[PDB]
Design a binder for this molecule. Structure first.
Ligand SMILES: *[C@@H]1O[C@H](CO)[C@@H](O[C@@H]2O[C@H](CO)[C@@H](O)[C@H](O)[C@H]2NC(C)=O)[C@H](O)[C@H]1NC(C)=O
Ligand SMILES: *[C@@H]1O[C@H](CO)[C@@H](O[C@@H]2O[C@H](CO)[C@@H](O)[C@H](O)[C@H]2NC(C)=O)[C@H](O)[C@H]1NC(C)=O
Ligand SMILES: *[C@@H]1O[C@H](CO)[C@@H](O[C@@H]2O[C@H](CO)[C@@H](O)[C@H](O)[C@H]2NC(C)=O)[C@H](O)[C@H]1NC(C)=O
Ligand SMILES: *[C@@H]1O[C@H](CO)[C@@H](O[C@@H]2O[C@H](CO)[C@@H](O)[C@H](O)[C@H]2NC(C)=O)[C@H](O)[C@H]1NC(C)=O
Ligand SMILES: *[C@@H]1O[C@H](CO)[C@@H](O[C@@H]2O[C@H](CO)[C@@H](O)[C@H](O)[C@H]2NC(C)=O)[C@H](O)[C@H]1NC(C)=O
Ligand SMILES: *[C@@H]1O[C@H](CO)[C@@H](O[C@@H]2O[C@H](CO)[C@@H](O)[C@H](O)[C@H]2NC(C)=O)[C@H](O)[C@H]1NC(C)=O
Ligand SMILES: *[C@@H]1O[C@H](CO)[C@@H](O)[C@H](O)[C@H]1NC(C)=O
Ligand SMILES: *[C@@H]1O[C@H](CO)[C@@H](O)[C@H](O)[C@H]1NC(C)=O
Ligand SMILES: *[C@@H]1O[C@H](CO)[C@@H](O)[C@H](O)[C@H]1NC(C)=O
Ligand SMILES: *[C@@H]1O[C@H](CO)[C@@H](O)[C@H](O)[C@H]1NC(C)=O
Ligand SMILES: *[C@@H]1O[C@H](CO)[C@@H](O)[C@H](O)[C@H]1NC(C)=O
Lengths: 247, 197, 50, 99, 50
């Protein structure tokens, strides 16, 4: 199916103008890092044996660059995580008075109830993704003791295939996201070029409407339905993410 | 059947005729003793998670050790300190027993400060060679393991009715470097893998 | 200078490896073509040369 | 650059380029009280290419990124429907040229 | 060990994932079943006829 067909009715003199807009909130995901790994020289290709160690020393010195390459990859990953979320070094605390116009922002902002500062949608996204690799700490004690049947993580650890942890904790990325959110909801976009300059959220919405070509008096004449539409869109995003579990 | 490793008693279940059991990929990891019919378990005599943190040979000789995803209770068990040199046994236990979320970090002391990261270590923790020798009485320049500074915190004071406007600007000139090309190379067919013959 | 230097180093480093890796035996009796050619006859030195 | 972009200068470098970016980077901020609109004669009088900034018991139109106070003329603002709608509109006299 | 795992006498600032060079096996053990019986090699190789 090639989508759906439609007609426009040019007519050579006809103006089509909207009368009622519909604020839409869309989700776009983007991977910013990958699980860095390191491999041991002799543990994999000779296990533990002195004879194979001698034969490998005589054969060559390959791993001296292999690990190096992987090492570089690891560094790269950190830089990526340090390039996307660390745009601004200043951290802006969440506003103490929650009156951003009709907008609520009760789910994007961090949730103080939970001990972790993971807001609400961030925790939902954490739960949706089923991280099945050795992300949880598979300590050496689990592999050594209290074992019944072999698992692949223990084999990877025993054959030298170790997995390094990311430099930035998920709480640290949460702190960056919260700081950027507070800056963009309180100071508008000034903090991306200078300091944090207070902008009432209605004035910021007027700024952005003026930017998109729709002059002011469209926000101000009726903004209650705009805030209601934004809240409904946020609720729909929450419902879709919590139900489909496929994004 | 010969092989190197560490044996240990285990509760593995073996069929009556079975003599040995392998790992996921053809690696005999649990043999049965013939003289006692009891089941043994073979673990590799190698724990690769050791990361050495160094301030550079031409800056000092002290180093820090980070064993991967272990508590500071099994490190002598994990690395077999009883079969190691005394100098290695020094880096097994002691006073600097700082524990992180990526294994503990014997070798360096932990501080409550929030200095900027110098040498990345693991999840959140960094380390640096600081000249605390003046600050810490008569001690020497030492390796410290702090937690990263997340920039600097700030407040905006929304107040729901407030405008902030600059009065004096500051022209800034910033440098951004970008590589545009790399050294092209060519290789000969026979003169490399055969020289002249 | 940073990354502008780094790439150059990388290239040079690669080339250095491509030379320093000529000493790898790769299973042969000796990682010297002249030595094998002088020590073993063609029918038996052929496998080492391959 | 970091701030608002003005211009750039290229410089050759070994197998690469160096860009010198000139940016505005405003500083020396001052925070005053503000309003979105002024209901004068029952008219919203929304600002045009500027914002309303009030000193002690005063009102002015100023550009967003620089402090350039101006008197509330009929060319600096435009009206659009009764002001009961605007939420937070502060009423004031809207000066007029041609008077 | 850090010097050995990257093959240089000079090590610069940073963290390095070293190889395994600490522990070396020093004792060897052998476990064979209780048999203590010889083959009839003298009853096979010294047979009257094959
Ligand atoms: C004005 O809008 C109406 C909306 O119906 C247009 O009428 C439709 O035009 C499309 C495109 O030609 C046709 O496919 C539909 O079948 C038309 N439906 C009706 C109800 O007529 C109309 O054409 C538009 N303006 C003009 C006159 O072009
Ligand atoms: C703004 O968001 C907050 C989030 O807590 C809403 O507060 C909750 O509202 C629901 C009903 O919608 C109640 O059942 C909860 O008990 C409330 N919790 C708290 C902490 O107040 C608030 O109602 C929302 N306001 C709107 C609609 O703008
Ligand atoms: C623009 O669309 C919105 C969205 O439907 C309209 O608001 C609705 O108005 C009806 C009738 O009062 C209510 O029953 C709905 O609950 C409202 N929905 C929302 C989200 O506001 C609004 O009336 C429309 N305006 C114009 C001028 O067409
Ligand atoms: C195989 O022979 C060994 C002796 O070479 C047996 O080991 C002995 O076991 C008895 C009873 O537990 C002990 O009292 C002796 O001290 C052991 N001696 C040694 C040297 O181990 C072993 O039990 C025998 N196993 C089988 C299955 O016959
Ligand atoms: C902006 O106005 C406020 C209100 O008086 C000035 O004071 C700040 O108020 C906030 C919220 O209470 C505090 O968090 C700040 O710490 C206060 N000022 C400081 C920097 O200590 C504020 O100074 C004004 N901004 C200016 C003058 O740039
Ligand atoms: C300024 O605004 C206030 C609040 O709207 C006005 O107060 C009321 O304004 C309406 C409309 O003019 C009058 O009908 C009421 O009698 C006013 N009541 C009060 C509280 O005084 C006030 O009139 C406005 N003044 C200006 C400058 O227009
Ligand atoms: C490390 O200590 C924690 C806290 O008691 C425990 O949950 C975990 O199982 C321990 N791991 C090992 C390998 O001993
Ligand atoms: C070590 O550093 C000092 C000071 O920079 C320098 O003079 C000396 O030559 C360096 N030696 C080595 C080992 O590189
Ligand atoms: C940090 O301070 C706490 C008490 O506030 C103390 O228990 C802890 O040992 C300190 N950590 C250091 C000094 O590294
Ligand atoms: C106007 O603003 C200036 C600078 O803040 C101030 O010195 C002056 O007193 C103000 N006058 C009023 C109250 O309009
Ligand atoms: C917040 O600002 C709005 C702007 O319309 C105003 O109506 C409201 O009364 C203000 N509330 C506070 C907390 O001052």
């Amino acid at each position: 199916s090639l989508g759906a067909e439609n007609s426009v009715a040019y007519s050579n003199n006809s103006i089509a103008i909207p009368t009622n807009f519909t604020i839409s909130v869309t989700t776009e995901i983007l991977p910013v890092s990958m699980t860095k790994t390191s491999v041991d020289c002799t543990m994999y290709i000779c296990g533990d044996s002195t004879e194979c160690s001698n034969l490998l020393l005589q054969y060559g010195s390959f791993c001296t660059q292999l690990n190096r390459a992987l090492t570089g990859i690891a560094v790269e990953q950190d830089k990526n995580t340090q390039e996307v979320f660390a745009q601004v070094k200043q951290i802006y605390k969440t506003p103490q008075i929650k009156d951003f116009g009709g907008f609520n922002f009760s789910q994007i902002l961090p949730d103080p109830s939970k001990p972790s500062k993971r807001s609400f949608i961030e925790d939902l996204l954490f739960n949706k993704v089923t991280l099945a690799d050795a992300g949880f700490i598979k300590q050496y004690g689990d592999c050594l003791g209290d074992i019944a049947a072999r698992d692949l993580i223990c084999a990877q650890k025993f054959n030298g295939l170790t997995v390094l942890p990311p430099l930035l904790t998920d709480e640290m990325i949460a702190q960056y996201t919260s700081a950027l959110l507070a800056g963009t909801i309180t100071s508008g976009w000034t903090f991306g070029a200078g300091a944090a300059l207070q902008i009432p959220f209605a004035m910021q919405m007027a700024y952005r409407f003026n930017g998109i070509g729709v002059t002011q008096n469209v926000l101000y004449e009726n903004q209650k339905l705009i805030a209601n539409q934004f809240n409904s869109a946020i609720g729909k995003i929450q419902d879709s993410l919590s139900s489909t579990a496929s994004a | 059947l010969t092989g190197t490793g560490v044996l240990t008693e285990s509760n593995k279940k073996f069929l009556p005729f079975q003599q040995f059991g392998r790992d996921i990929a053809d690696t005999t990891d649990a043999v049965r003793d013939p003289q006692t019919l009891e089941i043994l378990d073979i673990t590799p005599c190698s724990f690769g998670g050791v990361s050495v943190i160094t301030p550079g040979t031409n800056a000092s000789n002290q180093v820090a050790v980070l064993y991967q995803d272990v508590n500071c209770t099994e490190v002598p068990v994990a690395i077999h300190a009883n079969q190691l040199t005394p100098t290695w046994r020094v880096y097994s236990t002691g006073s600097n027993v700082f524990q992180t979320r990526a294994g503990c970090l014997i070798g360096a002391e932990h501080v409550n400060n929030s200095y900027e990261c110098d040498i990345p270590i693991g999840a959140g923790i960094c380390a640096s060679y600081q000249t605390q020798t003046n600050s810490r009485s008569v001690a020497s320049q030492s390796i410290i393991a702090y937690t990263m500074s997340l920039g600097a915190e700030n407040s905006v004071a929304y107040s729901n009715n407030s405008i902030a406007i600059p009065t004096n600007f500051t022209i800034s000139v910033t440098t951004e470097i970008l590589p545009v090309s790399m050294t092209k190379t060519s290789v000969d067919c026979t003169m490399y893998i055969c020289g002249d013959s | 200078l940073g990354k502008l230097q780094d790439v150059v180093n990388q290239n040079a480093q690669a080339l250095n490896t491509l030379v320093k890796q000529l000493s790898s035996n790769f299973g042969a009796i000796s990682s010297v073509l002249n030595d094998i050619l002088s020590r073993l006859d063609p029918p038996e030195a052929e496998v080492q040369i391959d | 650059g970091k701030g608002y972009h003005l211009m750039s200068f290229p410089q050759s470098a070994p197998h690469g380029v160096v860009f010198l970016h000139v940016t505005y980077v405003p500083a020396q901020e001052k925070n005053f009280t503000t309003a979105p609109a002024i209901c004068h004669d029952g008219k919203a009088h929304f600002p045009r290419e500027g914002v309303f900034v009030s000193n002690g018991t005063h009102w002015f139109v100023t550009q967003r990124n620089f402090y350039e106070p101006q008197i509330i003329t009929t060319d600096n603002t435009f009206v659009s429907g009764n002001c009961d709608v605007v939420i937070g509109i502060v009423n004031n006299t809207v000066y007029d040229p041609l008077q | 060990e850090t010097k050995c795992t990257l093959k240089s006498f000079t090590v610069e600032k940073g963290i390095y994932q070293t190889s395994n060079f600490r522990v070396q096996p020093t004792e060897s053990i052998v476990r064979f079943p209780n048999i203590t019986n010889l083959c009839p090699f003298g009853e096979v190789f010294n047979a009257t006829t094959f």
